Amino acid sequence: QIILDLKIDPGERMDPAVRMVAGVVGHLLFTAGGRFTNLTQNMARQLDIALNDYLLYMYNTRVQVNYGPTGEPLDFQIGRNQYDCNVFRADFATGTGYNG
Amino acid sequence: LLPDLIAGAHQNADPVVLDVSWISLWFAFNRSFEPTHRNEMLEVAPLIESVYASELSVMKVDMRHLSLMQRRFPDVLIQARPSHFWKAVLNDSPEAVKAV
Amino acid sequence: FTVPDVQKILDDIKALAAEQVYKIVKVPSISFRHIVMQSRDRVLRVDTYYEEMSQVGDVITEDEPEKFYSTIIKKVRFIRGKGSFILHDIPTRDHRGMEVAEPEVLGVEFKNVLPVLTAEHRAMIQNALDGSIIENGNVATRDVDVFIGACSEPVYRIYNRLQGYIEAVQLQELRNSIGWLERLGHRKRITYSQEVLTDFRRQDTIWVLALQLPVNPQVVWDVPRSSIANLIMNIATCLPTGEYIAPNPRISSITLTQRITTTGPFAILTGSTPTAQQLNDVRKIYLALMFPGQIILDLKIDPGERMDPAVRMVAGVVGHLLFTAGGRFTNLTQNMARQLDIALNDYLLYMYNTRVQVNYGPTGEPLDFQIGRNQYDCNVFRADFATGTGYNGWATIDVEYREPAPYVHAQRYIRYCGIDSRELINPTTYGIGMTYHCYNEMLRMLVAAGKDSEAAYFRSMLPFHMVRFARINQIINEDLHSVFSLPDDMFNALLPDLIAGAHQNADPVVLDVSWISLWFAFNRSFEPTHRNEMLEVAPLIESVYASELSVMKVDMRHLSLMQRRFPDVLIQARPSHFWKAVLNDSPEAVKAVMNLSHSHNFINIRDMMRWVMLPSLQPSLKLALEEEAWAAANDFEDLMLTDQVYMHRDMLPEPRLDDIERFRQEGFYYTNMLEAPPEIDRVVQYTYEIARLQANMGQFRAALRRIMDDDDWVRFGGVLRTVRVKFYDARPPDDVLQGLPFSYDTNERGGLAYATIKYATETTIFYLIYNVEFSNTPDSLVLINPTYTMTKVFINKRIVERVRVGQILAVLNRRFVAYKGKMRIMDITQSLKMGTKLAAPTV
Amino acid sequence: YIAPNPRISSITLTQRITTTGPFAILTGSTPTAQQLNDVRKIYLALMFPG
Amino acid sequence: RMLVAAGKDSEAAYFRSMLPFHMVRFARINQIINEDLHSVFSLPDDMFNA
């Protein structure tokens, strides 16, 4: 029965890492699938972008990435075991990528 | 509600939309909720709404009766509008449920 | 940054974005009025719209067609702004168990005929008032009201069109606008908001948008010879500003001053210090690298300056690495390549010793030899744009079409030396172990020349090199994607454009710098620590700009067809006349925007004609309103100008009052309005030439008196005349009654006779009412000599009508839409501008 | 007598960077009385051919 | 075409920009010659062709 949203305004300044960690905590802290909902589509997409960008920006020596066909975020495979991050995208009918 | 929101169907129950900040998610990640005591008015919770229900019951009843004369008598109700008897009953009524 | 004129004009554009043409009222504009005579059952119904146009503008004359165009545009804008209103919070009452409207919201005023009515008429008008109903209809699954009112057709069509526009906005446009905008937010790394769509009233609120969001790229691109203008305004609105930083000096300390006793050219150029001109030149170089093809660098050597050999050989060997100028695009003209190659051929020969055997090539072309123990063929490093060798993009993928782009005419993702623009860069550690072909081969031939120190230097600052191309990669592939970018087929032609030697295409601008400038560019790196602040308003700017362009396009399309419809009044005219007519009636913003382009290169009328036959137009409310307005304004009869005028003697009626009461019950009025044009046998066409010869012979006035004794009609000229409406209660003045539709003067000067004849340009229509007194004789108005009137004008449209008691309400045939007073209306057009930029992580 | 548009020789791109004319050294020049006389003479020879 | 062949480009660009001014100056001089000067004191075609 309650819907959240994300606020922007120029009056505040932050380290960009807040969103980098915020995508992770959002995917680990809300439920957006099953038989109900807690998110709306736009901020779910924003969290998807945040998690993708956290999985992309890295500081050690580089590992190899293979990008997928479409321009949707998380369309790639990564690393030595070739783990597919495409399962982490959010869809309301399916509900992958959250606590539910 | 979930098919309503995912299909855009017109619904009676609006899910209330709120807004938080980005770093607030990470802060809420590092907290826990502990109710060291329970609400006192819980011990008088049920009977309250019973009184609530009773008042609503009463008003619903005379609402119906008002409609009767709209069918019964057109000439003394030349300017009949449902808001007329709605406000007439809603004036002579306890202010509590009206405030609710 | 920007020159202040462009900043001022873009601020003016944003200001011009934020005004409102539509209106929200409670009762629509009143269109019909009733004049009550001494007649108690017949009144004069007059639609006030006709007289309302009749009092606007100045007289039309054939000598000034530009003023004619200005008046036409003014009247069209008058009718356009006349009906731009939306009904909201409409009053009503309730009886017969049904909600009934108000006589005011009917749009018709007849309050001044009630007290002279009778009992039966009051009963009938009461029943007719009770007749009107309001239906609880629906639109887009939202409840609305339907009722019947009265309005003139030209306003009604614009009202219907705006209803269609708002229905289309409420149906599909805003969702796809939001989706498009969010795709830009994803790609451009810019965050937006939807808070205003998410209150607890969102389900029952009517949305309004003034600007359509998705912008057609061809509408900006079709502007002829505006490529330079698009470029300059792109770099004005999208180019950000960072800072320059050098790497650790211990690098250059250990690589080119490992030996202290000896020295090299690089050892002397690494201790150099710049001046302001070199910083400006490095600015120019980075500007060139942020825009391939359109910006090309050239060379200057100042007359007061002298070059140094160390400077030039270092310049060549470093410029082989700082540019990509081959393959499918280019960066530098051929002269640049020739001097860089000459400097290379000098650098590979200054220290030539026994331990290196070099086989000189037979050709006289410079840089033709083989060097090293492998005896590598150094002939590859010729700079030909066909193969692209000698640059950085040689043997490297640069142009690709990965995913469906937001901006449909720009699909590109430009990747220099194989790096990708999707990974965010950690510049302190990124780039230790990435490489490509040309850099490695350059290292191999540097060692093959025996130059150890330069090899160590370049290998040391390989990460520096590639990370500043990484920053440039970011600044090119996320910020600069907009409708101002170079179109794909347009972009494909630059290499044929450069190598062919012709200029059918737009010629890219050129730029010039110095030799040591590229050295001072090499050992610096750019960082975008502060992005430009006008990014979040760009989509709004395009939608307005595209709207104004489409407005002038449709104005050209219809106004170019004026002369064919009216030959006799636009005889001496030119297309330049309506060109200046619309230049006088447009805001200054688009004029300045086309000033930045058309100042450099010339345009002509056929350029505009081909521009306006281009079918590119951008969806907007103003376009819809104007298009249906000009469609409604096609009949110039509604444009209060006509030629159906006649000078004909008729007699005013002078009635017999046998019964005062019966005559008073009926409504008698006079008008010299003509029901139909007369037969062609009773009228003769007169021009200036026949009148001139008539005066010349000396039988001018006598001919007119004779032909009018013949009781005929005269059509003085085919020149249009302004029309004017009057109402009176008494006799009109003699000037308008007995007046002549022409002018004729003759004087004497110096033994000669002079004569001039004019045709009247101002004509009027008027209505006369007869009021009688009870104690009057039946022959009170009877005169021995009836009066002469000599003005007759014909109009198709029934401007004024005498109406009986019941026929007044037959006008009720307009289907009007209403929104409930418990609704609310907002607009979120300026809400397009909101948004924040996600600064990339930086070290 | 009318001078040409100043924007033909150069165009600006930002606050500091701007193109320069190939004949920039000759563009910044102003005639004398004799040079005005010569300009008049050229236009008169132009205006009557032959 | 000659200056393009001569490797000279910026001068060619300046002239290609300059051309319309040149030809409209000559268009106006054509108007002056053919319209303004029609008088008996103009040279007849015999002398002009001789």
mmCIF file of N, CA, C and O in Angstrom, chain C residues 699-757:
data_model
loop_
_atom_site.group_PDB
_atom_site.id
_atom_site.type_symbol
_atom_site.label_atom_id
_atom_site.label_comp_id
_atom_site.label_asym_id
_atom_site.label_seq_id
_atom_site.Cartn_x
_atom_site.Cartn_y
_atom_site.Cartn_z
ATOM 1 N N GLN C 699 -15.562 64.222 -71.702
ATOM 2 C CA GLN C 699 -16.947 63.785 -71.546
ATOM 3 C C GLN C 699 -17.057 62.764 -70.426
ATOM 4 O O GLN C 699 -17.772 61.763 -70.541
ATOM 5 N N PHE C 700 -16.351 63.004 -69.323
ATOM 6 C CA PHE C 700 -16.318 62.053 -68.220
ATOM 7 C C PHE C 700 -17.608 62.062 -67.414
ATOM 8 O O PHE C 700 -18.322 61.056 -67.373
ATOM 9 N N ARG C 701 -17.913 63.194 -66.775
ATOM 10 C CA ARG C 701 -19.062 63.254 -65.877
ATOM 11 C C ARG C 701 -20.371 63.051 -66.628
ATOM 12 O O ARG C 701 -21.297 62.415 -66.108
ATOM 13 N N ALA C 702 -20.467 63.588 -67.849
ATOM 14 C CA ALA C 702 -21.693 63.453 -68.631
ATOM 15 C C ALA C 702 -21.991 61.995 -68.938
ATOM 16 O O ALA C 702 -23.153 61.573 -68.918
ATOM 17 N N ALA C 703 -20.950 61.209 -69.223
ATOM 18 C CA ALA C 703 -21.142 59.784 -69.459
ATOM 19 C C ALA C 703 -21.693 59.091 -68.220
ATOM 20 O O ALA C 703 -22.576 58.233 -68.324
ATOM 21 N N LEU C 704 -21.181 59.452 -67.041
ATOM 22 C CA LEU C 704 -21.682 58.857 -65.807
ATOM 23 C C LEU C 704 -23.130 59.247 -65.547
ATOM 24 O O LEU C 704 -23.942 58.401 -65.157
ATOM 25 N N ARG C 705 -23.478 60.517 -65.771
ATOM 26 C CA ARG C 705 -24.864 60.932 -65.574
ATOM 27 C C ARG C 705 -25.792 60.220 -66.554
ATOM 28 O O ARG C 705 -26.896 59.809 -66.181
ATOM 29 N N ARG C 706 -25.348 60.033 -67.802
ATOM 30 C CA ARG C 706 -26.161 59.315 -68.781
ATOM 31 C C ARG C 706 -26.351 57.856 -68.385
ATOM 32 O O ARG C 706 -27.480 57.347 -68.359
ATOM 33 N N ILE C 707 -25.253 57.163 -68.074
ATOM 34 C CA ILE C 707 -25.344 55.744 -67.755
ATOM 35 C C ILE C 707 -26.110 55.538 -66.457
ATOM 36 O O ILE C 707 -26.689 54.470 -66.226
ATOM 37 N N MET C 708 -26.134 56.545 -65.582
ATOM 38 C CA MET C 708 -26.917 56.354 -64.378
ATOM 39 C C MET C 708 -28.381 56.709 -64.612
ATOM 40 O O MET C 708 -29.270 56.149 -63.960
ATOM 41 N N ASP C 709 -28.658 57.612 -65.554
ATOM 42 C CA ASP C 709 -30.026 57.752 -66.034
ATOM 43 C C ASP C 709 -30.510 56.457 -66.666
ATOM 44 O O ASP C 709 -31.711 56.165 -66.646
ATOM 45 N N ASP C 710 -29.586 55.663 -67.214
ATOM 46 C CA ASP C 710 -29.901 54.320 -67.682
ATOM 47 C C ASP C 710 -30.207 53.359 -66.540
ATOM 48 O O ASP C 710 -30.660 52.239 -66.808
ATOM 49 N N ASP C 711 -29.961 53.765 -65.291
ATOM 50 C CA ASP C 711 -30.231 52.966 -64.094
ATOM 51 C C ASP C 711 -29.447 51.651 -64.117
ATOM 52 O O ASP C 711 -30.009 50.555 -64.148
ATOM 53 N N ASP C 712 -28.126 51.784 -64.092
ATOM 54 C CA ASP C 712 -27.214 50.654 -64.195
ATOM 55 C C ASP C 712 -26.357 50.544 -62.933
ATOM 56 O O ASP C 712 -26.574 51.242 -61.938
ATOM 57 N N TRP C 713 -25.375 49.648 -62.990
ATOM 58 C CA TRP C 713 -24.475 49.370 -61.884
ATOM 59 C C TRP C 713 -23.043 49.572 -62.358
ATOM 60 O O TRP C 713 -22.733 49.376 -63.535
ATOM 61 N N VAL C 714 -22.173 49.983 -61.440
ATOM 62 C CA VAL C 714 -20.782 50.278 -61.760
ATOM 63 C C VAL C 714 -19.881 49.552 -60.772
ATOM 64 O O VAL C 714 -20.059 49.678 -59.556
ATOM 65 N N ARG C 715 -18.909 48.807 -61.291
ATOM 66 C CA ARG C 715 -17.916 48.106 -60.481
ATOM 67 C C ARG C 715 -16.590 48.831 -60.674
ATOM 68 O O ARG C 715 -15.795 48.471 -61.544
ATOM 69 N N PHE C 716 -16.356 49.853 -59.855
ATOM 70 C CA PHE C 716 -15.153 50.671 -59.975
ATOM 71 C C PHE C 716 -13.950 49.850 -59.529
ATOM 72 O O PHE C 716 -13.675 49.721 -58.334
ATOM 73 N N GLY C 717 -13.227 49.297 -60.496
ATOM 74 C CA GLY C 717 -11.971 48.627 -60.223
ATOM 75 C C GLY C 717 -12.153 47.265 -59.575
ATOM 76 O O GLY C 717 -13.179 46.942 -58.981
ATOM 77 N N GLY C 718 -11.106 46.454 -59.698
ATOM 78 C CA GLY C 718 -11.099 45.139 -59.092
ATOM 79 C C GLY C 718 -10.285 45.121 -57.818
ATOM 80 O O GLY C 718 -10.070 44.064 -57.218
ATOM 81 N N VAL C 719 -9.840 46.298 -57.392
ATOM 82 C CA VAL C 719 -9.029 46.429 -56.188
ATOM 83 C C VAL C 719 -9.914 46.206 -54.970
ATOM 84 O O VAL C 719 -11.005 46.779 -54.866
ATOM 85 N N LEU C 720 -9.451 45.363 -54.052
ATOM 86 C CA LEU C 720 -10.208 45.051 -52.850
ATOM 87 C C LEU C 720 -10.349 46.288 -51.968
ATOM 88 O O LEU C 720 -9.545 47.222 -52.032
ATOM 89 N N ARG C 721 -11.396 46.296 -51.148
ATOM 90 C CA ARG C 721 -11.679 47.416 -50.266
ATOM 91 C C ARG C 721 -11.932 46.912 -48.852
ATOM 92 O O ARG C 721 -12.442 45.806 -48.651
ATOM 93 N N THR C 722 -11.566 47.735 -47.872
ATOM 94 C CA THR C 722 -11.876 47.451 -46.477
ATOM 95 C C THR C 722 -13.352 47.720 -46.213
ATOM 96 O O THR C 722 -13.916 48.687 -46.728
ATOM 97 N N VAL C 723 -13.980 46.861 -45.410
ATOM 98 C CA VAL C 723 -15.404 46.969 -45.114
ATOM 99 C C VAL C 723 -15.581 47.363 -43.653
ATOM 100 O O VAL C 723 -14.774 46.992 -42.793
ATOM 101 N N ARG C 724 -16.633 48.134 -43.382
ATOM 102 C CA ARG C 724 -16.907 48.701 -42.068
ATOM 103 C C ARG C 724 -18.394 48.579 -41.754
ATOM 104 O O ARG C 724 -19.237 48.851 -42.613
ATOM 105 N N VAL C 725 -18.715 48.183 -40.517
ATOM 106 C CA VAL C 725 -20.096 47.947 -40.095
ATOM 107 C C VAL C 725 -20.572 49.090 -39.206
ATOM 108 O O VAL C 725 -19.852 49.538 -38.305
ATOM 109 N N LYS C 726 -21.787 49.574 -39.470
ATOM 110 C CA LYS C 726 -22.453 50.597 -38.669
ATOM 111 C C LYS C 726 -23.881 50.197 -38.333
ATOM 112 O O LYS C 726 -24.532 49.469 -39.089
ATOM 113 N N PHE C 727 -24.355 50.696 -37.194
ATOM 114 C CA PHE C 727 -25.752 50.652 -36.792
ATOM 115 C C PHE C 727 -26.169 52.056 -36.383
ATOM 116 O O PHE C 727 -25.386 52.783 -35.765
ATOM 117 N N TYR C 728 -27.398 52.442 -36.719
ATOM 118 C CA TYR C 728 -27.878 53.771 -36.370
ATOM 119 C C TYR C 728 -29.351 53.703 -35.998
ATOM 120 O O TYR C 728 -30.045 52.728 -36.299
ATOM 121 N N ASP C 729 -29.821 54.761 -35.335
ATOM 122 C CA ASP C 729 -31.238 54.932 -35.050
ATOM 123 C C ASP C 729 -31.891 56.033 -35.868
ATOM 124 O O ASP C 729 -33.117 56.028 -36.010
ATOM 125 N N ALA C 730 -31.113 56.965 -36.401
ATOM 126 C CA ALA C 730 -31.618 58.078 -37.190
ATOM 127 C C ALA C 730 -31.039 57.994 -38.598
ATOM 128 O O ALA C 730 -30.400 57.007 -38.970
ATOM 129 N N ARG C 731 -31.278 59.034 -39.386
ATOM 130 C CA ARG C 731 -30.709 59.084 -40.721
ATOM 131 C C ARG C 731 -29.188 59.213 -40.637
ATOM 132 O O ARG C 731 -28.666 59.854 -39.718
ATOM 133 N N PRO C 732 -28.452 58.590 -41.549
ATOM 134 C CA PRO C 732 -27.000 58.754 -41.567
ATOM 135 C C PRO C 732 -26.628 60.119 -42.112
ATOM 136 O O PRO C 732 -27.470 60.805 -42.709
ATOM 137 N N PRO C 733 -25.388 60.560 -41.916
ATOM 138 C CA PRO C 733 -24.956 61.827 -42.512
ATOM 139 C C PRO C 733 -24.916 61.753 -44.031
ATOM 140 O O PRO C 733 -24.816 60.681 -44.632
ATOM 141 N N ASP C 734 -25.007 62.936 -44.648
ATOM 142 C CA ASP C 734 -25.025 63.039 -46.107
ATOM 143 C C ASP C 734 -23.737 62.516 -46.730
ATOM 144 O O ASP C 734 -23.753 62.040 -47.870
ATOM 145 N N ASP C 735 -22.622 62.591 -45.998
ATOM 146 C CA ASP C 735 -21.331 62.187 -46.548
ATOM 147 C C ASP C 735 -21.313 60.705 -46.906
ATOM 148 O O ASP C 735 -20.767 60.317 -47.945
ATOM 149 N N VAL C 736 -21.901 59.861 -46.061
ATOM 150 C CA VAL C 736 -21.894 58.432 -46.348
ATOM 151 C C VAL C 736 -23.052 58.059 -47.271
ATOM 152 O O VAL C 736 -22.984 57.049 -47.979
ATOM 153 N N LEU C 737 -24.110 58.866 -47.307
ATOM 154 C CA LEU C 737 -25.263 58.521 -48.130
ATOM 155 C C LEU C 737 -25.060 58.940 -49.581
ATOM 156 O O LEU C 737 -25.051 58.101 -50.487
ATOM 157 N N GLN C 738 -24.888 60.239 -49.818
ATOM 158 C CA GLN C 738 -24.777 60.772 -51.170
ATOM 159 C C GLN C 738 -23.374 60.645 -51.748
ATOM 160 O O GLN C 738 -23.154 61.081 -52.884
ATOM 161 N N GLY C 739 -22.434 60.069 -51.005
ATOM 162 C CA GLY C 739 -21.046 60.092 -51.433
ATOM 163 C C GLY C 739 -20.814 59.235 -52.665
ATOM 164 O O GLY C 739 -21.562 58.297 -52.946
ATOM 165 N N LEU C 740 -19.764 59.575 -53.409
ATOM 166 C CA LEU C 740 -19.263 58.970 -54.636
ATOM 167 C C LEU C 740 -18.120 58.007 -54.326
ATOM 168 O O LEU C 740 -17.365 58.224 -53.375
ATOM 169 N N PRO C 741 -17.996 56.936 -55.100
ATOM 170 C CA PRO C 741 -16.947 55.944 -54.837
ATOM 171 C C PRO C 741 -15.634 56.258 -55.534
ATOM 172 O O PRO C 741 -14.817 55.357 -55.746
ATOM 173 N N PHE C 742 -15.435 57.502 -55.951
ATOM 174 C CA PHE C 742 -14.234 57.850 -56.691
ATOM 175 C C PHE C 742 -13.840 59.281 -56.356
ATOM 176 O O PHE C 742 -14.373 59.895 -55.430
ATOM 177 N N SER C 743 -12.877 59.799 -57.108
ATOM 178 C CA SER C 743 -12.423 61.171 -56.954
ATOM 179 C C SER C 743 -11.930 61.672 -58.300
ATOM 180 O O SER C 743 -11.338 60.912 -59.068
ATOM 181 N N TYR C 744 -12.158 62.955 -58.570
ATOM 182 C CA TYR C 744 -11.853 63.540 -59.871
ATOM 183 C C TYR C 744 -11.505 65.004 -59.673
ATOM 184 O O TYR C 744 -12.365 65.788 -59.263
ATOM 185 N N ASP C 745 -10.262 65.378 -59.966
ATOM 186 C CA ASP C 745 -9.862 66.772 -59.864
ATOM 187 C C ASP C 745 -9.152 67.222 -61.133
ATOM 188 O O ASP C 745 -8.566 66.417 -61.864
ATOM 189 N N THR C 746 -9.226 68.526 -61.385
ATOM 190 C CA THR C 746 -8.650 69.126 -62.578
ATOM 191 C C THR C 746 -8.283 70.564 -62.253
ATOM 192 O O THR C 746 -9.114 71.314 -61.733
ATOM 193 N N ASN C 747 -7.044 70.942 -62.555
ATOM 194 C CA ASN C 747 -6.566 72.295 -62.316
ATOM 195 C C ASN C 747 -5.768 72.802 -63.509
ATOM 196 O O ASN C 747 -5.512 72.069 -64.470
ATOM 197 N N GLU C 748 -5.401 74.074 -63.442
ATOM 198 C CA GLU C 748 -4.649 74.743 -64.492
ATOM 199 C C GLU C 748 -3.282 75.123 -63.942
ATOM 200 O O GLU C 748 -3.178 75.585 -62.802
ATOM 201 N N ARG C 749 -2.240 74.925 -64.746
ATOM 202 C CA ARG C 749 -0.896 75.323 -64.352
ATOM 203 C C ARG C 749 -0.068 75.645 -65.583
ATOM 204 O O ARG C 749 0.116 74.787 -66.452
ATOM 205 N N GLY C 750 0.415 76.882 -65.650
ATOM 206 C CA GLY C 750 1.374 77.292 -66.665
ATOM 207 C C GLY C 750 0.916 77.082 -68.091
ATOM 208 O O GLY C 750 1.713 76.665 -68.940
ATOM 209 N N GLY C 751 -0.352 77.357 -68.375
ATOM 210 C CA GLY C 751 -0.875 77.143 -69.706
ATOM 211 C C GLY C 751 -1.273 75.720 -70.014
ATOM 212 O O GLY C 751 -1.605 75.427 -71.167
ATOM 213 N N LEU C 752 -1.259 74.827 -69.029
ATOM 214 C CA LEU C 752 -1.614 73.433 -69.238
ATOM 215 C C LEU C 752 -2.739 73.018 -68.304
ATOM 216 O O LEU C 752 -2.948 73.618 -67.244
ATOM 217 N N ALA C 753 -3.464 71.982 -68.712
ATOM 218 C CA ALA C 753 -4.548 71.415 -67.925
ATOM 219 C C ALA C 753 -4.089 70.095 -67.323
ATOM 220 O O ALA C 753 -3.559 69.235 -68.034
ATOM 221 N N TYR C 754 -4.283 69.943 -66.014
ATOM 222 C CA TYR C 754 -3.901 68.742 -65.288
ATOM 223 C C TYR C 754 -5.143 68.114 -64.676
ATOM 224 O O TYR C 754 -6.041 68.822 -64.216
ATOM 225 N N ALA C 755 -5.196 66.783 -64.676
ATOM 226 C CA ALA C 755 -6.349 66.070 -64.144
ATOM 227 C C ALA C 755 -5.895 64.758 -63.522
ATOM 228 O O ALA C 755 -5.019 64.079 -64.063
ATOM 229 N N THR C 756 -6.493 64.413 -62.381
ATOM 230 C CA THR C 756 -6.206 63.157 -61.695
ATOM 231 C C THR C 756 -7.518 62.518 -61.258
ATOM 232 O O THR C 756 -8.475 63.218 -60.899
ATOM 233 N N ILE C 757 -7.571 61.186 -61.311
ATOM 234 C CA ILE C 757 -8.749 60.421 -60.921
ATOM 235 C C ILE C 757 -8.322 59.308 -59.969
ATOM 236 O O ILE C 757 -7.337 58.608 -60.226
#
